[PDB]
From a paper:
Diadenosine-5′,5-P1,P4-tetraphosphate ([name]) is a ubiquitous second messenger from bacteria to higher eukaryotes, which responds to environmental stresses and cell cycle phases. [name] then binds to the [name] ([name]), thereby disrupting the protein–protein interaction with microphthalmia-associated transcription factor (MITF), and the released MITF eventually promotes the transcription of mast cell activation genes. The [name] protein is a compact and symmetric dimer, with two adenosine pockets at opposite sides. Here we report that [name] specifically polymerizes [name] into ([name]-[name])n (HAn) filaments in solution and in the activated RBL cells.
[name] was reported to efficiently hydrolyze aminoacyl-adenylate (aa-AMP) and ADP, but neither ATP nor ApnA (such as Ap3A, [name], and Ap5A). For comparison, we also solved the HINT1WT-ATP and HINT1WT-Ap5A structures at resolutions of 1.52 and 1.31 Å, respectively. Consistent with previous reports, two [name] molecules formed a dimer through the five-stranded β-sheet and the central helix in the crystal structure. Despite having co-crystallized with different ligands, the three structures were nearly identical, with root mean square deviations (RMSDs) < 0.083 Å. However, in all the three structures, only the electron density corresponding to an AMP molecule was observed in the adenosine pocket, indicating that the ligands had been hydrolyzed by the HINT1WT protein during the crystallization, which took 3–7 days at 18 °C with a high protein concentration of ~2 mM.
Author numbering:
A (entry chain A): 14 to 126
B (entry chain B): 12 to 126
Write the structure that this text describes.
């Protein structure tokens, strides 16, 4: 699970509002939401950042997106949404555990930050 | 047609020009014509999928491949300080081209919220 706050969430050591879980990922609402709906999908495998993801992780990363789109549908995001992965300082990555943001429930703007 | 009817299908089939960064049997990476950061490119599947909301379960590996190719291209382009990957879905996402694609933006500080 790794040595970050997302590791603690995966291990159930600290609370989060969990939307979905399977054997390889977890989806939960962001504690600092930037839209009326704002959740994260994260792998249980501790990949610190997308830049170090291995080729073998390919389908796992895609799994985050499929889970993300399924959760968005369940949460009634029928007008759309934005998915985001942040890498490093320029990317504004807040936690060094790969996470896919899903934001919706309002018009998302351009540029995306 | 392989690649679909959108402008991105035409790019895939070399019918309209693009500044291509990477190409394989599954995907294509090329620079965005309206960049929102000093470096701003797209990674798209060669298979037409209109939007992420209609992607099939068995599209998992392909979607992941877009991300892996995205991060490799970013490294090759020297985005060592980081970058942001984005998918715009539907009206609230601001989607304008209905062929699934991953934006990769870098070369400046990205801000929060992401739009
Ligand atoms: N012919 C083209 N070549 C490269 N990028 C394009 C082209 N046409 C549109 N785009 C970009 O594709 C994106 C489509 O918007 P969206 O669907 O919200 O991602 C925008 O960033 C456009 O600038």
């Amino acid at each position: 699970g790794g040595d970050t706050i997302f590791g603690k969430i995966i291990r159930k050591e600290i609370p989060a509002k969990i939307i979905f879980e399977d054997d390889r990922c977890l989806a939960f609402h962001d504690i600092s939401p930037q839209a009326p709906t704002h959740f994260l999908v994260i792998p249980k495998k501790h990949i610190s950042q997308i830049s170090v993801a291995e080729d073998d992780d390919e389908s796992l990363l895609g799994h985050l997106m499929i889970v993300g789109k399924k959760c968005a549908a369940d949460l009634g995001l029928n007008k759309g949404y934005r998915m985001v992965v942040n890498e490093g300082s320029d990317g504004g990555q807040s936690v060094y555990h790969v996470h896919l943001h899903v934001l919706g429930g309002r018009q998302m703007h351009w540029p995306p930050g």
